[PDB]
């Protein structure tokens, strides 16, 4: 199938409580494989998946160094951003970063990503061309001009087309028994009367990986998007995910409702009814 490698970095200032915390987490698809936290007793790049543990001591030593350097760069960025927005030294602010690569079934680059948000708002992003930037506002235009002057897009393009795709291919090979295995959902429909007139039908999906799933209710073959309560997909804590979808139905009309499930792990899509 298609795969992604992504690092999710958070830097958060805390005036009066030391320097900004930096945390970086790496994922292959929906599987975390590394973490760095500047607040850890002895900050190290640490393994968070079994197939990474084999990498060897230089993997750990140099990744630890790249993360410690990234801690300092994100603190520099937070100082600059406070200035660009004319903000006081009193407030806490957040810088987030997403970067990495997507590959197709043959391991070929599909697209690269390098984007940033400040206080939860999009700030700047590398365009799909990997050559040019999109800046959200006149503050991000300063970063854009600086990065154009320093030819940063060229460095990012070389990382995303070379190192990123090469490491993702090696992780997929080393973790093939888990990262290349789709676990289908286990499904059931529950029924709870709410009154004499109405009942809740709830369509369950449990134990699936990866997290991407489609769960719908239909009434007489018509999608019920507006009348369905769909909970966010949630982690079980054992690598797999859960989700449910519920509709309130008139008593006696339960068999007009079908729950439809699509997921990569299923040999074919499921149609479920109550009982």
């Amino acid at each position: 199938g298609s795969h992604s490698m992504r690092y999710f970095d958070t830097a958060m200032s805390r005036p009066g409580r030391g320097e900004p915390r930096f945390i970086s987490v790496g994922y292959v698809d929906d599987t975390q494989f590394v973490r760095f936290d500047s607040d850890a007793a002895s900050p190290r790049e640490e393994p968070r998946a079994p197939w990474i543990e084999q990498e060897g001591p230089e993997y750990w030593d140099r990744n630890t160094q790249i993360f410690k350097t990234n801690t300092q760069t994100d603190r520099c960025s937070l100082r600059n951003l406070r200035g660009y927005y004319n903000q006081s030294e009193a407030g806490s602010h957040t810088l987030q970063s997403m970067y990495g690569c997507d590959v197709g079934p043959d391991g070929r680059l599909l697209r690269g990503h390098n984007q940033y948000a400040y206080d939860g708002k999009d700030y700047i992003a590398l365009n799909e061309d990997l050559r040019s930037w999109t800046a959200a506002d006149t503050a991000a235009q300063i970063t854009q001009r600086k990065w154009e002057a320093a030819r940063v897009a060229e460095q990012d393009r070389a990382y995303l087309e070379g190192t990123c795709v090469e490491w993702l291919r090696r992780y997929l090979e080393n973790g093939k028994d888990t990262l290349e295995r789709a676990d289908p959902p286990k499904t059931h429909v529950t029924h709870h009367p709410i009154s004499d007139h109405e009942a809740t039908l709830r369509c369950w999906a449990l134990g699936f990986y990866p997290a991407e799933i489609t769960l719908t209710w239909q009434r007489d073959g018509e999608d019920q998007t507006q009348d369905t309560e769909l909970v966010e997909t949630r982690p079980a804590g054992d690598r797999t995910f859960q989700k449910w979808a519920a509709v309130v139905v008139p008593s006696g009309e339960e068999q007009r409702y079908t729950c439809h499930v699509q997921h990569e792990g299923l040999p074919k899509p499921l149609t479920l009814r109550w009982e």
Binding site: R62, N70, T143
Partner: peptide, 9 residues
């Protein structure tokens, strides 16, 4: 050949 270097905004 390791995780990504960042640049200051």
């Amino acid at each position: 050949a390791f995780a990504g270097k960042k640049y200051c905004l």
